[PDB]
């Protein structure tokens, strides 16, 4: 049940995004699907040389699950997944190398929407969410949960409370009260159709409806 501290660049970064009055917040969703697609690219690459890598979850998919009652939006994929080392280290130093670059770009006039070219698009989720849990399962490890309140610290804990993923990652975004449109099927459909034409993988949406009886 370990606590860790964000680097000063990432804490700076998270503070910008969570407090930004940036209007086009729907790009948060394009960015998380791009993280997902890359993770699926990666297991697909490995499974080419070692097809047993897919046995943990033979289906390759992205899945969006609005949880209206909890005001949480979940984003799941069957990509490579992340080990405990990956989560504790926030993927290491090379992955976040562009954080300062990106922040310098924003000072010069850049659109928050180019965050993904600096390799840190994950943190765009704080445009719409004030809290996040990241559940992940890598073939080389057990299942873990990373969690952040958008503060200086985050936690990583062995996963003994969530559905088994088999392989891959699920994000649960605790939506800011001004962003609940993104629990809506129509809104979610608008945004995926807009920004995700060239994602090679099926993008599934899970919508809960009452049976008129
Ligand atoms: C570790 C984090 C909790 C905090 C973090 O810092 C971070 C970042 C970073 F900013 F570093 F780029 N990116 N990022 C993230 C978030 C979802 C995923 C996915 N849905 O799989 C992901 N996939 C990578 C995993 C590694 C493989 O090489 C390729 C596929 C990465 C995270 C999640």
Numbering used by the authors: 6 to 218
From the primary publication:
Hsp90 is essential in all eukaryotes where it regulates the form and function of diverse client proteins, many of which are key signal transducers. Hsp90 enables drug resistance via multiple molecular mechanisms, most notably through the stabilization of the stress-activated protein phosphatase calcineurin and multiple components of Pkc1 mitogen-activated protein kinase (MAPK) cell wall integrity pathway. Hsp90 also serves as the previously enigmatic thermal sensor that controls temperature-dependent morphogenetic switching in C. albicans, a key factor contributing to the organism’s virulence. To identify potentially exploitable differences in the Hsp90 expressed by a fungal pathogen vs humans, we determined the crystal structure of the C. albicans Hsp90 N-terminal domain, which includes the nucleotide-binding pocket targeted by all Hsp90 inhibitors in clinical development.
